[PDB]
Structure formats: C-alpha cells, structure tokens
C-alpha cells in the first residue's frame, strides 16, 4: 500500500518536508522524480518506506475558510474559519498569483493541519 | 477479519484510493473486483492486508450537513455543518442522478471522507 | 482477555458488522452463536481471534440525543445532539418496535458506531 | 509498569468488564483478589497481561455534570454537562444509597467516558 | 531520549502513579529519586523504560480555568473552563500554600492530569 | 526520513526540551549543535534516533490567538483563542524582544507545544 502527504518544500539537496500521518517529515524522493517541478502544497504518495513515489494535485475536498487578508509576504494569507477560527495557511500556486486577485471574503479550499489554501470556490449569485 | 473504506478513485493500473483508518491508502483489489463496474464513493471491505475483497454500497448513517450549492463541475458540492462549518465534498451517484438538489437539502455525509452520499427528508 | 463491539448488521453469509476499538469490521460468530436469533445494536463479545463469542445486552450508558424523525425506511432515524449537530443512525431492535415525535423524545445514542439504543421517559 | 481502569461489572464465573485504555473488556482478576468485595466504579490496577492485580477507590478529580433525575432503574442518572451535554451514567454506591438522597441540580463528578458518577460535590452557600 | 509525565501520588513500595501518554500509570523510580522529597503534580522525567529519571517543577504553559472553590478536604479545588465546563482538579504545593484563592482566581491546569498549578495575575 | 519538533527549552547539561510527535521529550543535540546559539521556540529536525541534527525556521502557519497580556516573567504570555480559550504559552525568541497590549496583538500560537512565534500585523 500507499500513503500520502502535502508537500511543504523542497531543498537545495532534493529532499523534502511533507505533512503526513499528522506530521512534518523531511523525506527522499525516488530518482524518477524531477523535484525541480514540484509545487508546494500538492498531495504526494509515499511508499513504505516513506519514499515520495509520484505527486498528484491539489486537495480538491475538505474545508472551508474565507479569506481575510494576503500577509505582506504575499506568500501567506489570513483565513477566518466557522466558528470564527483565525488561522494563517500557505497559499499554494494557483491563488498566488498575481489576471484576477484574491479578496478579502472570498471563499478558499484549505487543509489546516497541513496549513495551505488550494483553490477559490466562486459565487454568491 | 474484514475492515472497510470509503472508495476515492480508481488509477489505470487497476489500484484504487480509499480513505481507511483516519487517511487516504493506495490499495490493490482482488481477483473478483472488476474495477470498472465501481462507484465512487461507495464502501468496500478490506481484508488484513489491505486489499479490496468486495464493493459495497453507500454509507448509511453519520452526519447530516445542509446544502448550499453544487459546483460548477458537477461533481462536488459545498455543504453547511451544525456549527456553520463550510466543507467542499464529493457527490455521490445517487445525489448526482437526481441532482435538484436545491439549494437547503438535508445530506447525508462523510466530511473525513469527503462525501455526501444520500438526500434526508426533512419533511416526509 | 475478551473485547466487545456494537452490533451493527448482520449479512446473508452469517458474517456480521461490528463496531469495535472504534472501528466498523466484519467478522464470523462462533458456532454456537445462532446468527438468526442476534439482535441489531446488541453489545457482542469478541475473543482475541475477534470471533463472536457471546451476544449480550444493549449499551445502557452515555450520549443522549434528541429524535427529530424516524426515515422513511423505519431501520434509521434523524437526531439532534447537544450542540445542535444532526445525524443518521440505526434503531437497535427493541426502538425498531414503535416511537412518535416531531411533527421530542430522548434517545441514548453511540454517534461513533451510529446506534439509538433506547428511549429515556419511562419506557422499556 | 501497571495500567488502570474503570471496573463496570462483576460476572458469575470471577470475569469482569473494565473500561480500559478507551474501550469496554473483559478481564481476569488475581487469585489473590476477592471479587466479592469489588465496587462498581472503583479505579482497578491492571498488569502488563491486563490480569485485575489490585482494586483502589473512585476517581476523586474530573469532570462535573449536573443531576437532572435518576432513571426510574435507581440505577442510573441523566446528568448535564457544560455545553448542554446530557448523558446516562451509572452511579457509583456511595451515591446510589438511598441517610440523604440525591435531588436534581446536585453536581456530581463524573467520568463521561466509561459512563459513572462516583461522589456529589457539596455548597454554594 | 527522554519523555515526561505529571506525578500523581506515590506509593508504599515506592512506585508512583504518573499521567503520562494520555493515562495513568504505576512506574518505578531509580536509585537516585527520594521518593519521600517528591511534590504531587511536579512534572517527571521518564527514560525508555518508563522508569522516573528526575523530578521536576510544575507545567508552566497550557489552560487556563478559574476558581470557584476549594474543596473541604483543602486538596482539591471546583474550577471552570471557558465554555463553563466545570472540574474538580487537585490543588499542587503553591496554590495550597497561598490558599487565597477566591472566590475567580485565574489558575494554570491540567485537565487531563487532573491538576492546578499557578495562579495567573489578570492583572498586574 | 527525519522528523521535526519546536524545541522548549535549553538545559544547563546541553540537552533541549523539544515538542514532537505530539508530546514533550528531552533530546540531545549532534556535536555539531551550538546549544548556545538555540533560539527559543524554533523547529529543530530530528534523526530516527531522535538526535537534534540541525535548528531551523519558526512555525510560520497555524491558529492565531489574541493577546491579552505578558506574564510578570517576561517568557510567556497569556492569549485567547477563538472560542475565548484562554491558554498560557512561551514566547518564542523573536517575540521575547518586546509588544504591548491589553491594557490586543494577534500571534501565531502552536497551542499543543506551548508556543507564540510571530505576531501579525506589519512585524518581522
């Protein structure tokens, strides 16, 4: 069988920290891998011995939280949660940039174990 | 012995995903699942090595959240939990075959999972 | 030493669900166990193989909820929790034997293997 | 190293149930032991083979619920909990005599994972 | 490499009961420890063995409840939480020492533990 | 494969208490380790002998809580969480250099190791 992560960096020497069974990990990736095209935040399978085997995409069900505020960084955002949970959370690719920008209310797709918002989910009316 | 999990996707080399034990597990199948005939969503039993022994039906109890609207895909839907907790989850065939669904339709769910698996009267 | 479980279901094959060290398994009676004579919801006793050793008597103590209806196919019924969390869960057999609120009445509940076990007014 | 547990039940053949490590089981006691003289509720020692090696007394720390009635049984109470939270527990000896008797708003220490209520805590004023 | 737990009493043989992982349980000492100049609630070090190493001081970071009051046996004190859920916790060395304590005090606990340790300023 | 922790605290004897795989244990450091230049609250990597093997970053993700005052100490702080929790934590390094509310601040808290690490507003 297979596990699987959220990939959270990726180092000069081509390991990698994962969040995987509730925790960071700093991990290998098998040679096939091209590490230089890894994105931050996307789901990755490990083998038994915790090996990263393939990447996958973004998270694509779970959590919501609406957006407050993108740090200065322009690297983190402010989320606030149901019951009025404040939370800081990486965003991931796709909402980084910058064309359209991210709003304070919108609504964002987020794992807040492995602290990342993956994707914006559209429209009031 | 037999465990379960809640069958996530199939890959092309007849593997499959399935959230199990708290976490999602890329699982082999016996010799008797004919991958193409599964359904998302759907309950299967796992025997000690984790492999999928049979293909069950959907869940049948658990929480209920309420729906606010389906997405744009077509395959998932965002829902409303008792303490006003917004989740993006899958549809299941069921939900999808009659997908009205309104908005306000009471769902049966798997929010670890990531499912919403059968429409509650509120009502009847 | 022996570990017990929640009666969940019981299948064509004399196999029955169980929820046990919180988790839903399918696993074999002891010969001795009349599978016919088991009665959903019912507490069961397990050896360490997990075989069903003993059948026993409905959980007595923990959560109470709140009935909001009984669904349509009179095996499941809609609660309401203390913080006003909705769920499914299966009636235990002496429920299955009649109700009657909203259009109210107190249940004792295990959300984690999804059971009503009994009504708390006066009744038995 | 010894573990511990709630004791739930005493069976004709010396067996007992103990609520143990978050589940119900059934266990064996020490010849030495006198089933005869154990008490609903107490706290039980288990060694490392789960064998009952000592009985001790009721938990004196926890949570507090407040008595709503005592079932019709005279065996068991609903109470209410913080948040609104109403469960059934047994109740321990000390509490099931009947001299004093318990009235409903009495708090009562309980642990709400193996089910019991094991001692009323007195005074507002 | 070490772990900890919090001393909970001790006993004739000179074994304690220390929470640690989640639940209580009876451990030894080494050569080194004078059970008789422990301090119940103090934080001990634990080798691989689970035998206590050395004892420490009281937790110094984690919930806060407030003080409704202490109990008459003068050990143990009525605290409540923030969503008023109310515990009997014992009462560590300098909170006995002090016992002044009001009534609304704030007190650094242990919930799991079972214990109070400091008394937080509003305050100053 | 490495793990990770938040390191607690540095000992007199060079070993550091550190918060990893959701509990407190004492660790040593590789000779390597300047236990000098250790700064309260970073995440330190761990070898699968638990060995600290190289000090890193400060968490920069997770709960945020409200500051409602620095304790007498000046080394931890007394913050409120969203469903007005009120917890003792440390400050981590970069915060122990200075504040001031309450008399309001919003940090980013781990509240499982005990910890505040940055505070956020316009503050590096």
């Given at each position: 069988?297979?596990?699987?992560?959220?990939?959270?960096?990726?180092?000069?020497?081509?390991?990698?920290?994962?969040?995987?069974?509730?925790?960071?990990?700093?991990?290998?990736?098998?040679?096939?891998?091209?590490?230089?095209?890894?994105?931050?935040?996307?789901?990755?399978?490990?083998?038994?011995?915790?090996?990263?085997?393939?990447?996958?995409?973004?998270?694509?069900?779970?959590?919501?939280?609406?957006?407050?505020?993108?740090?200065?960084?322009?690297?983190?955002?402010?989320?606030?949660?149901?019951?009025?949970?404040?939370?800081?959370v990486?965003?991931?690719?796709?909402?980084?940039?910058?064309?359209?920008?991210?709003?304070?209310?919108?609504?964002?797709?987020?794992?807040?174990?492995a602290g990342?918002?993956?994707?914006?989910?559209?429209?009031?009316?």
């Amino acid at each position: 069988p297979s596990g699987y992560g959220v990939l959270l960096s990726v180092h000069e020497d081509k390991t990698v920290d994962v969040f995987t069974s509730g925790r960071k990990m700093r991990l290998t990736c098998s040679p096939n891998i091209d590490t230089d095209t890894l994105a931050l935040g996307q789901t990755v399978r490990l083998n038994e011995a915790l090996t990263i085997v393939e990447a996958g995409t973004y998270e694509q069900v779970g959590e919501i939280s609406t957006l407050r505020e993108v740090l200065d960084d322009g690297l983190r955002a402010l989320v606030v949660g149901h019951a009025d949970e404040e939370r800081i959370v990486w965003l991931a690719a796709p909402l980084a940039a910058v064309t359209r920008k991210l709003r304070p209310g919108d609504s964002l797709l987020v794992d807040t174990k492995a602290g990342y918002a993956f994707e914006r989910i559209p429209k009031a009316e």
